[PDB]
Amino acid sequence: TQMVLRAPKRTELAKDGSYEKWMIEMEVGLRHRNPYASGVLFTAAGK
């Protein structure tokens, strides 16, 4: 599940200064159910 904590939001801008700079923030995390359910397969060269 693409866990989401904080959606993209902006702070209090426009103090009639050097503003007009924007940003895109995102707080996201990963989660897995029953670790012994999926699988990973690495690449092998020797032994």
């Binding site: 007009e20 700079k21 924007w22 940003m23």
Partner: protein
């Protein structure tokens, strides 16, 4: 790393050429307009007085 989305987002960055020409040069010709025209047949004519 452009981050500030300033108020300038023109992908079509073409210029702003004008669509006219201010050719202010006189063309009036009152002397010739008043004189008159007449056809001839040779390069050297003559008139009597």
């Amino acid at each position: 790393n452009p981050t500030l989305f300033v108020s300038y987002d023109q992908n079509g960055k073409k210029l702003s050429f004008a669509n006219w020409i201010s050719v202010l040069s006189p063309q009036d010709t009152p002397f010739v307009s008043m004189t008159g025209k007449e056809s001839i047949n040779q390069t050297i004519f003559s008139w009597q007085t």
